[PDB]
Amino acid sequence: KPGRTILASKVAETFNTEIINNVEEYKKTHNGQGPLLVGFLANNDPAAKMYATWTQKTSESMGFRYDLRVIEDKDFLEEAIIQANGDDSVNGIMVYFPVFGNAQDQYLQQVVCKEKDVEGLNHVYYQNLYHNVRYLDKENRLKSILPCTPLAIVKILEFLKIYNNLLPEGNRLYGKKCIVINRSEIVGRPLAALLANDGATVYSVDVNNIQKFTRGESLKLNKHHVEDLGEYSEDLLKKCSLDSDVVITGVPSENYKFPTEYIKEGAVCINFACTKNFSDDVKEKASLYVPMTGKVTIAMLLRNMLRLVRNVELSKE
Amino acid sequence: KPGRTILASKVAETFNTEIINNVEEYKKTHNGQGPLLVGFLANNDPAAKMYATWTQKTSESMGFRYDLRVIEDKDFLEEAIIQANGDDSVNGIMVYFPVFGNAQDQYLQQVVCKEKDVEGLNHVYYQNLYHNVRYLDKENRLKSILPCTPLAIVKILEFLKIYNNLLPEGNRLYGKKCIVINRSEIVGRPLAALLANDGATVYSVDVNNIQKFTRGESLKLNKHHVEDLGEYSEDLLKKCSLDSDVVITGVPSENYKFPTEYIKEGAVCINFACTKNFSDDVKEKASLYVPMTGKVTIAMLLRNMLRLVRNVELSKE
Ligand SMILES: NC(=O)c1ccc[n+]([C@@H]2O[C@H](COP(=O)([O-])OP(=O)(O)OC[C@H]3O[C@@H](n4cnc5c(N)ncnc54)[C@H](O)[C@@H]3O)[C@@H](O)[C@H]2O)c1
């Protein structure tokens, strides 16, 4: 029996009602105006532009004052971010990567004012995710947000009902096997960790080697315990994936193909890469298939902003 | 006439007297004990171990309580850093890269407690270097340190007398042409920038393309203006280098060779890569030749620590 297909939009539909209401309350207190979310586009990519347009329309639709400040020359994007940080009118900032396409982007993600960083690119949010820190302040008022991409995927699994919503917080994924074909510091590694923290065993795939992320094994630090595995062998990946009942993928290659033999029956497949790295025939094998995150990522990024704003008001004094 | 050769040690000799005296004053106030500098070694590299030993002996020699906490499995190095951050006894922390050998190391460099980060790996010090910020606080008490590697190279040039010590601060390199064969976010890019900020025109070389870093061109941000150049062409590099009277190199390849034809007569050559990327015959062409930074980097890293400590006492209330 062929597997169904769930669109990112359908998942995002769920959050609309929640997000909207939060914005309305904001509008009251802030004399009719909603929060100003700025988006920096500094790359010449049709896909990025398309996504940017999506974020634009979706946010405006909800009631956000969205501004898409496009930069010509890469190096000035930084400067733009600086004055934007100081711009009180600006309530949230996001950057459309790849800007430079290397370490620089990772530098830039640390330039955005932490309080306004809606995507959760700032290092602090990453540490907190790895060390299971829920808040920021001592008095537990300011809740620490998580980077939208992995947070979205999680929410996707929650929607798909994989997260057994009958177990205590941080263990809903107990008896589950997951595999993430990506270990990028921006999404892959954090995603795998985030999953493992919820109970599931994770097979983290990388070009060089594979690893097995599991629950924290220390008392000095509540961080996921990594179990290193054999060097990247094609047939090895197969074995790992076959055991995994949940597979996530995010390889940048526009011509990547995840062998459908690897997919286990009933396996839930999710792709976050801006490209189609999944082989079409995957439908009959996977129980559920989500072609691309995108729209879901946007919803999270938005609600994250709402949390940041609430945090600003919460830390106003 | 063949060019001379200056050893990193000889340069570091200069700072000994300064560093020592600062430590003695510290010893008084802190009942005979000097500052505790911890070094995390988590890589299986003969060179790194050798360097670690050097830092160990040099610091102890000066009067620093040096501890070399070696970690077996990479993933636990992080945890070690955390408890070390909280360890009040620890006055400074440094990490021996490559730990993981990828993005992770860049993640880890942001895990070290900013106040104890002696090498200047933390993002804040990088921003300040790029935005010419001298201090941290509003009242201009806490001076912001710069990452030891590029800071060392600068000090090397200051020693070599390239920095015309008769011009006002931040313009001693005015009529000088420099080229940096490295654009790593950790050293290359910051170094080139740091140089340009002092007046000199910089040719930043990368595997993909070359660029021309120059003085700040904006009023909204005091950041060096980058002039992008043609894609990396071998004979192009030649042209750039020929104009450059000062050449710095840091390519990781143990078998790299910088064609001596590129070197201009009287050109000052410096290498910071842990490997010999310079062709031996370079002596007759270059006016001065510094084989490797190492020892100088250590001295800076040390004095940086002294500044951090002074900053801690300075921000005690
Ligand atoms: N949907 C979104 O909102 C969103 C957000 C962030 C990232 N992304 C996607 O993720 C990509 C991130 O890649 P990057 O720029 O960090 O590049 P990179 O190549 O440095 O990292 C890619 C990661 O995937 C791994 N990978 C690459 N080829 C692989 C292969 N053949 N087999 C197994 N693993 C492989 C790499 O080892 C690495 O861990 C982006 O290009 C984008 O397409 C999408």
Ligand SMILES: NC(=O)c1ccc[n+]([C@@H]2O[C@H](COP(=O)([O-])OP(=O)(O)OC[C@H]3O[C@@H](n4cnc5c(N)ncnc54)[C@H](O)[C@@H]3O)[C@@H](O)[C@H]2O)c1
């Ligand atoms: N002496 C010290 O204390 C110290 C400190 C930091 C770094 N280092 C050295 O610098 C290296 C940093 O490299 P990385 O790990 O970031 O690796 P990487 O390959 O990601 O970056 C190396 C940088 O040099 C450039 N480069 C590489 N090959 C080149 C070539 N053939 N021609 C021109 N440019 C080239 C790359 O484009 C990049 O900008 C280290 O391996 C180490 O050897 C030494």
